[PDB]
Design a protein around this ligand. Sequence first.
Ligand code: COA
Ligand code: COA
Lengths: 388, 388, 287, 287
Amino acid sequence: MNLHEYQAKQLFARYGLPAPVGYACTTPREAEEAASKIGAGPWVVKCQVHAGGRGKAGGVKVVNSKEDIRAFAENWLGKRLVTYQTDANGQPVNQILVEAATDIAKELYLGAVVDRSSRRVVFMASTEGGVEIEKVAEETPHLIHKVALDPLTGPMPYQGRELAFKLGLEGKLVQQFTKIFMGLATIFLERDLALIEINPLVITKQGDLICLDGKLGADGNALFRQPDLREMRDQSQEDPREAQAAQWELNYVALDGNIGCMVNGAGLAMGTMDIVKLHGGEPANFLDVGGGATKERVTEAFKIILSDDKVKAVLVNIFGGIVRCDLIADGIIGAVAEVGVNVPVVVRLEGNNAELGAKKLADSGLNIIAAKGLTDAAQQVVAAVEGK
Amino acid sequence: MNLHEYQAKQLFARYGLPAPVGYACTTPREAEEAASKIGAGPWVVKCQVHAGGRGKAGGVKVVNSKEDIRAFAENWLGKRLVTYQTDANGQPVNQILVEAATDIAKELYLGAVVDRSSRRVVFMASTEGGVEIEKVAEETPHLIHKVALDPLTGPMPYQGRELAFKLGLEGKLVQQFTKIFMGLATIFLERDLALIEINPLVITKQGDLICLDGKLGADGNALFRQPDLREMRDQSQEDPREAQAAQWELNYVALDGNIGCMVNGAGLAMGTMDIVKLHGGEPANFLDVGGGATKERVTEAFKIILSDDKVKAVLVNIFGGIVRCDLIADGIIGAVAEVGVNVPVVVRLEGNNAELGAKKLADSGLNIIAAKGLTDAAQQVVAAVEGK
Amino acid sequence: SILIDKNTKVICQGFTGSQGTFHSEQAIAYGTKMVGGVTPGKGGTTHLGLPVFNTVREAVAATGATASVIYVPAPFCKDSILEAIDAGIKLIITITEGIPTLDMLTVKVKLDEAGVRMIGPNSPGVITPGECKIGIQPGHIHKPGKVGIVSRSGTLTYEAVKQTTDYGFGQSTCVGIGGDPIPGSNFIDILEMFEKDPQTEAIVMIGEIGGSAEEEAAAYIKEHVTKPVVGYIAGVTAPKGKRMGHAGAIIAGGKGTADEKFAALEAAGVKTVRSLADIGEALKTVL
Amino acid sequence: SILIDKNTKVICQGFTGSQGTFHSEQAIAYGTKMVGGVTPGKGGTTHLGLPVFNTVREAVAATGATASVIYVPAPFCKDSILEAIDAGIKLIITITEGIPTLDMLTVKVKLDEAGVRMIGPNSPGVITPGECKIGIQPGHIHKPGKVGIVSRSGTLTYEAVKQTTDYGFGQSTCVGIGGDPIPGSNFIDILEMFEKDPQTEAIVMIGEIGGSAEEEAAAYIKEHVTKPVVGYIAGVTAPKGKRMGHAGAIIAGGKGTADEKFAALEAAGVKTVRSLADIGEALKTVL
Ligand SMILES: CC(C)(COP(=O)(O)OP(=O)(O)OC[C@H]1O[C@@H](n2cnc3c(N)ncnc32)[C@H](O)[C@@H]1OP(=O)(O)O)[C@@H](O)C(=O)NCCC(=O)NCCS
Ligand SMILES: CC(C)(COP(=O)(O)OP(=O)(O)OC[C@H]1O[C@@H](n2cnc3c(N)ncnc32)[C@H](O)[C@@H]1OP(=O)(O)O)[C@@H](O)C(=O)NCCC(=O)NCCS
């Protein structure tokens, strides 16, 4: 799960890492009042949304008057910010971070992720701050420096120094950088982060390192032991259907298309989406039933998939699971009736009572086709959205 | 460095481990007043000295009246407690720990040390609590259970459970034991301990685990990063000469004999002591000069070695070092004069200007013999204490 | 076959729990030599007619089991896995989903240093049709055969199982390496076992988006795998930077797309199939 | 000879510090191929005519050094040692005294897994007389020869050096494994190197109280060392449970006395000598 920039900075402060003086404000009045608590302008006002690219979307401004701060908060609070990293619906802005302006001398990049190839937390740094780090990796790989945290020893100062010297830092900036590495590495491990990105990690004109931005991602699998992080979840930043699906033990991810997909299995779900795509279809979503495709659960699945108006058909692909194919069919039938599923539904059942479940579907009289195999199921859902 | 039992228990409490309700008191008045803060007697009153065997020496009593607590504090405060683990001079009692009586159902042992053979922090537990753990290892090894902390993973609950089940604990005692293991293991690693011993780790009649005693030893090499532990050092518990020696970069350990030994090198010091012993002598001390045998340092060495009235001769064995043999001789000479060394001194110098240093010693006229080799040096110091 | 066979003695950690019970019943019905289970606190009892132990070491001393299947909730897995490694278990099949990536990061290092093989986590398990079933896969769709299957996905594996059983090829051993970002074993590890296994004549490798295990497996196959390999990668239509169900099904930093994996496999000579429904056909081709 | 020789290229960590400077001057005068040093913050300067680097990796890339001698204060050693291991250094000679036992516990595990050899800490160093000197030992008392010396003590080693030089045997290589409880290398590791070294004809093993490395070395010698070994253990008169200078010179739990070590060595066929002054005589005997 993602954290807001202001929350990332609070965490940094809690670990003695440096970030600008700032306040997260929920009302224009709070935002304007923060100006004086911060001091002499100008002030940086930033919409707090999980997505990046806020700057290019107008969500980050340097203003010099309390009236400008207020105008900005008024403009954004309760409005959705669309950036190149959100869908066209954007993310709601419920907090404006008002912080002190920072005199930037140089912009660096410092970040960390779990590198799956080397199976290590890898920190990476670059003199190329203020740029999409991927861009820099593409073009100037030789400018990206990395160190892998050794699980046996924990992060070591020499690794922080190594990056600091590759970045050509010198003097107090080396110790400051080392300190930042050790703290971010420590936070990474103690808080079970999946990702850290300080872009930019700034060298100020006054000669100090400061985290100008912060993007933290927590390992959701570890939230059971990160109570602080757990409370920081901002559900407004994501499609609310995902959390709805999750509390129903469904993994849902909204896509662009019009063919809803309800499948048990993440791999099967993606493969089903791909096969629908392969047969001229446009998957509207990823929905992995995982949990026992019970009647209640399948019903929720339909409710969630159908909350998207673009959905013109629903392909249900169930291979195995804990429920027998005929019980799954009874639930798909109950779901279609009780949800008032007004779209055609194509079902591919495999496992015990597969044909009997198919028969039950065919005999319900509801617009539910029991397909014969996967290719067939794909062609039929594809054909079922023709014209719609 | 060793901690007092009360300090060990404070640390345990700080880590959520269980210890009796108790107070460390420096005056009989405090000790008597602790009774009421603790509650209903009877109360356990324990002299706080680093050495064990306090029980058999009379330093641990279960009393049932405030007047008894006071009488006990009055008897011990400022008095030295001699146990089978101290020298005949004992250790000063400056604190009396007054704690609640504990209803003991069973006594167990839980402890940990750095095992040098397996190069791991090894925790060990036994149903044989209340006994010298060495005794149990000798006789009933099959009753001693061990687990080695994995440096890669840190202590794991299964290890705590493993010991708990080998101890035949069951039910809530298993979780409690596991919790105690995890906490003690954590303290061991975080505080850089060299040793933990809970003897006895008690199962109370009420069915709970409680640390009735606690013996913690800190790795002195790690005190630079254990500020809390550093402050807990009680210098009164050790021969004050050791700390004196240490601040002068000398490692001193008082022994029984009468031939003082001043050597540069721990190995050479022990070997020198052994050779003196081998030639009929009785080493009075271990004193490793280590630090540059300067005049000032050698002087301190003499002051420290000679503070023991039993010393009838001092063997100085210097092999190498940073100071030239003649400068060492000048310092031994200055030391002997300025300290008013009234005993014979035998010196064995090896290295640059060895013979010139010897000549300088022979020409000083002070009672300082420059020996020719080590065997000779030993025989001569041995011979120099004959009759004295 | 690889990893397990008719002689593999298996203990189950989390044996008395719902899934541990249910799936052990299935393994037991299949003929898997389950010899016992471990549930701290229930040692000395019997469950499914087998002894339950308080620790894996007691279980191993008592039964000689060399493999452990784990059905322990995520919060306790690292502990369970390290306990198994410590007790001498040589093969750990971890079914559990939700294990913190950092826990697996440490476990993977331990596994590799202790020389212990782990399949999973977040895995459907391992099955050598006709001989040994450890895991949650439905055993009736399998057929003792010659196709070795490795996959980051349970359900997709079943599809490949159905197909290879329907074309009569059958399966030598099916290995679900799981959908986590840091699995105990990767494609390369399993591919190497299939190459060295006489009974396996062809390999179906099933991957998906995220990480680079498939791309590395490709490079590995080109140079060290001589048997024919049919590949299928799910997620061509998955968005980037979004978890698609499996913790490991996420395209991080724009790297690890399905197309890149197909491409890397194709370039290594792997017979890739764009539709998961054509795995059997492609095997027929290369067989 | 073992460990080092005329061709060993050495860098010094803590190169610009007092001891690093002083002892590098000595190594340099002895002919040791010191090729550089590492002091974070002083990279790009020259000291003792050699390049100083900010990191060990820069130093290794620049000089090709395979050995590093460490003169870094105890608080930073673990970091220095892990940095050297990470930079590819294959031989680390750590002089530093005072390194927390727990730091060495972790370092020792890292050393063993990375296949990096470390002598020390709390060591006088290593010297192959006539070829290479790394450490603080006085080089003029040594003589290119046939006796390999391993010791937990610097000064005692010098005594053995004097004796073996005086009897004309000379030394192949002297290795101070150091006086810490968890050294990077123990007696067994060095003994094995001496047994396999043609130039070493006899071995002087010098131990002291504490731990059980000597007792294990005894068992090892009996079974795997064919060359003659002369042993000396200091501390017969040391009290129990008291640190005698070296952090590792402490008899813990009444185990590890000098007598037990003498006894264990004697029982393995090692020629033990009760007086440290008779090491040369005992070598003469077995030579
Ligand atoms: C592991 C998983 C199956 C557990 O679910 P579950 O059986 O309902 O959990 P339960 O609580 O009923 O049982 C777990 C048992 O583990 C036990 N347990 C806990 N810690 C343990 C340990 N260290 N060692 C052994 N057993 C342990 C518990 O005692 C419990 O048994 P009990 O009920 O007898 O006390 C579930 O958490 C999961 O990960 N599911 C996803 C599986 C998957 O989707 N795989 C991918 C292929 S598509
Ligand atoms: C290591 C030891 C010799 C250091 O003493 P020292 O040289 O006086 O210490 P100094 O502070 O002068 O020098 C240490 C240098 O290490 C450097 N240093 C610190 N951390 C470092 C690191 N990670 N990498 C490299 N160098 C580092 C410092 O920069 C300093 O050099 P500088 O003065 O140029 O800044 C001392 O702490 C010691 O352990 N002595 C006992 C040796 C012994 O008795 N051995 C046993 C055989 S009997």
